[PDB]
Design a protein around this nucleic acid. Structure first.
Ligand SMILES: [Mg+2]
Ligand SMILES: [Mg+2]
Lengths: 49, 16, 29, 444, 96
RNA sequence: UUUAAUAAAAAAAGUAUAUUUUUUUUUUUUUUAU
């Protein structure tokens, strides 16, 4: 559902290219990014704006 | 032909 | 004469989103 | 357009023999004018004995008889009246790839000796005819010289046990006439090492000697030692008796679905090995009758042989929880196991070979996650045979020495498939970059 | 791929709450094609409009097809590539 | 049994960006010799 937003457009501002790069990385090494999610669900308590 | 859509290849009922 | 008549009846029948409206058009014919 | 005499047509497989006999019968239905009658008889391996006996019939009324046969007419058969022979020069060889773990049934060209036996089968009466579709120089040069070895062909995991129990400390000390590649012999010795029959020093164990004393397969012999130790013997030995004999069920063309109903009446959903207990206990409850296994299509040759083997095993012993039975089989068959993968069906524990369940098995429509297979066949598709459900607790508690990440690290995932995208890599940022730089017309 | 969609639970509400976190909305917030199918089909509408307007003859007597000199109307249908504007939409290019 | 009928173009200055409804799944039952 994060990918589904970018199925349409080919003209992309830099924030969208950042999101697509993160999605493509998370598709390429899935165990590493899944381990990172497991770490953030345990020891992150201060978030960005 | 490959190019024509399927809304043209279809004959209606009353041409049958 | 038969095919073009079926086409006229079908196009009357196939607009007109109410049954009363198609009945109006066909009784107006 | 030739003289009278029976014909022997050298064919390869049962489907091939059936299709050639059907095409020849359709041709004999076509040639309905001034052609001699062609009595047809097919000869296959698992054919019924009443239908295997029909090949030795008399000739037709002033006409020809034809036996479409496999390689059984090479050396172990003798048909009367044979004056013609048509040999295509092909057979099926069983090539055992040990490191892959499977055995292939591959069509192989005939050597000089098998072609010689086929040409000699033409003349059991007198002056016959041998037609083999080959040039003479091609039949001399392209064909193999002598018979290929059985030591290099089949699995040597059984005979290595006997030559180890004889006491030969070295493999080349035996010095066979045609030795196999030592990859195959080393893999067979590796399997026999893993079966806990060979010690770490390279000598046979005491239980290794006791299992080499058995005539069955060495994995089956390990299961025999387990059934002796765990006191669950008789049902285990009954399944081993049903295993060592060829497949019991018969599949006709007229009564296929009724035979499917009899198989569905027999089989136990816990596994396939337990269905053999159901069949054996049904034949013993029927007191080895003829009507019961004649209706249920169980072969009487194979059933009487299973009775003889079970009695033989109990005699050489002399001098119903499913869980204990299945664990006793884990003790033998921990090596050949499978993990059910959702994308590609089934992976092997050794090497990751994409295998499959055969539809003739009990476990085809159903699925269990971890299963062990008795045998495996390389063909158009892999097929596992005699497949039972198993639990990974048993595969650990039996064999903590074969095993106890990296595959999790090397894995990848791909999104769900859509039809409308026409290339399921075009969502990527690399593909958007490439499409942009192609539309602009640059080139890197 | 149904065996990985056996695990997608809670999807009607997930699809509805995309209005609070996406600028470009979606009109079909109520159906989800993987879980629910194609609930509508409008292929026959395009056939009946061509009988409604009178056919390809009474459409093409309005158009400029007669001046082109194609042999047949069937050659109106191709995989037409845009060419210039496809090249030009990606360049560094002024607002105006 | 009878009756209701809108519109209709010149000049000047503009305009962001993605928006979509469209075609079946591929699932085959066969193992040489005892
Ligand atoms: Mg201005
Ligand atoms: Mg102004």
């Amino acid at each position: 559902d994060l990918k589904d937003v970018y199925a349409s457009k080919v003209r992309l501002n830099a924030s969208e290219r950042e999101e697509l790069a993160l999605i493509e990385e998370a598709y390429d090494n899935p165990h590493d990014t899944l381990n990172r999610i497991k770490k953030y669900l345990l020891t992150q308590r201060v978030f960005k704006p | 032909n490959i190019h024509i859509p399927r809304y043209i290849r279809n004959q209606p009922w009353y041409y049958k | 004469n038969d095919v073009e008549f079926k086409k006229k009846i079908y196009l009357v029948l196939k607009s007109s989103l109410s049954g009363d409206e198609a009945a109006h058009k066909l009784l107006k014919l | 357009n030739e003289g009278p005499g029976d014909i022997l047509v050298f064919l390869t497989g049962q489907e091939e023999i059936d299709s050639c006999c059907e095409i020849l019968y359709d041709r004999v239905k076509t040639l309905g004018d001034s052609i001699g009658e062609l009595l047809i008889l097919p000869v296959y391996s698992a054919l019924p004995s009443e239908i295997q006996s029909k090949i030795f019939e008399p000739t037709p009324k002033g006409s020809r008889k034809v036996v479409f046969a496999t390689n059984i007419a090479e050396t172990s058969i003798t048909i009367d009246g044979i004056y013609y022979v048509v040999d295509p020069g092909f057979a099926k060889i069983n090539i055992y790839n040990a490191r892959a773990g499977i055995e292939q049934l591959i069509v192989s060209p005939i050597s000089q000796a098998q072609a010689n036996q086929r040409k000699g089968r033409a003349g059991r009466t007198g002056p016959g005819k041998c037609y083999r579709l080959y040039t003479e120089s091609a039949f001399y040069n392209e064909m193999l010289e002598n018979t290929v070895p059985e030591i290099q062909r089949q699995n040597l995991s059984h005979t290595i046990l006997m030559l180890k129990a004889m006491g030969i400390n070295d493999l080349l000390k035996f010095d066979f006439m045609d030795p196999p590649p030592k990859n195959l012999m080393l893999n067979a010795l590796t399997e026999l090492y893993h079966l806990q029959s060979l010690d770490d020093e390279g000598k046979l164990t005491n239980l290794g000697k006791e299992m080499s004393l058995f005539p069955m397969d060495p994995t089956l012999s390990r299961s025999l030692l387990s059934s002796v130790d765990n006191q669950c013997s008789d049902e285990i030995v009954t399944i081993i008796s049903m295993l060592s004999v060829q497949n019991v069920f018969y599949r006709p063309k007229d009564r296929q679905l009724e035979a499917d109903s009899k198989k569905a009446k027999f089989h136990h959903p816990y596994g396939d090995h337990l269905t053999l207990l159901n069949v054996y206990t049904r034949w013993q409850q029927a007191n080895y009758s003829e009507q019961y296994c004649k209706t249920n299509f169980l072969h009487f040759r194979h059933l009487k042989r299973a009775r003889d083997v079970k009695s033989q095993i109990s005699m050489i012993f002399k001098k119903s929880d499913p869980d204990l039975i299945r664990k006793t089989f884990v003790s033998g068959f921990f090596m050949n196991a499978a993990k059910r993968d959702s994308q590609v069906g089934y992976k092997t524990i050794n090497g990751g070979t994409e295998v499959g369940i055969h539809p003739s098995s009990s476990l085809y429509g159903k699925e269990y996650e971890y299963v062990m297979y008795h045998s495996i066949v390389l063909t158009s598709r892999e097929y596992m045979s005699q497949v039972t459900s198993i639990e990974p607790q048993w595969l650990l508690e039996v064999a903590p020495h074969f095993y106890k990440s990296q595959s999790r690290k090397k894995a990848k995932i791909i999104p769900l498939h859509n039809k409308f995208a026409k290339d399921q890599n075009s969502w990527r940022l690399s593909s958007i970059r490439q499409s942009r730089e192609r539309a602009l017309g640059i080139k890197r | 791929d149904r065996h990985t969609l056996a695990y997608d639970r809670g999807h009607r509400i997930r699809r509805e709450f995309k209005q609070y976190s996406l600028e470009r909305n979606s009109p079909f917030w109520w159906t989800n094609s993987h879980h629910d199918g194609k609930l509508w089909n409008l292929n026959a509408y395009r056939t009946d409009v061509i009988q409604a307007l009178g056919g390809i003859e009474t459409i093409l007597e309005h158009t400029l097809f007669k001046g082109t000199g194609f042999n047949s109307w069937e050659g109106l249908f191709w995989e037409k590539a845009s060419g210039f504007e496809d090249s030009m939409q990606f360049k560094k290019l002024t607002h105006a």
